[PDB]
Amino acid sequence: ETGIGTLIIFIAMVLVAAVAATVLINTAGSLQQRATSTGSQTTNQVSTGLIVQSIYGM
């Protein structure tokens, strides 16, 4: 009967959907750390600087 064949494919459908879910989570986690670090590094880059007061010679 059709009942047996339906159950077999059902298991396969669940496993496939889990794979595509894993890709999206892993990619978002990788891009999270890069975007956070870039923001913090740029903030330090703009604000920081050195200034010359006076120059003397002998």
Add this chain to the structure above:
Amino acid sequence: ETGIGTLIIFIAMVLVAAVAATVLINTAGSLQQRATSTGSQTTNQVSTGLIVQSIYGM
């Protein structure tokens, strides 16, 4: 005759098809409550926050 044997297997075929039907309904009902709760919890998670106005010392 073939008529007797056909009826016996017919009963078995109906019962098997009912089993596979039950699996699909029960699984969909279980996934329904999880997906609904996840959506509502995330909406509250993003919107909610605390803000600092001013800090004084003595």
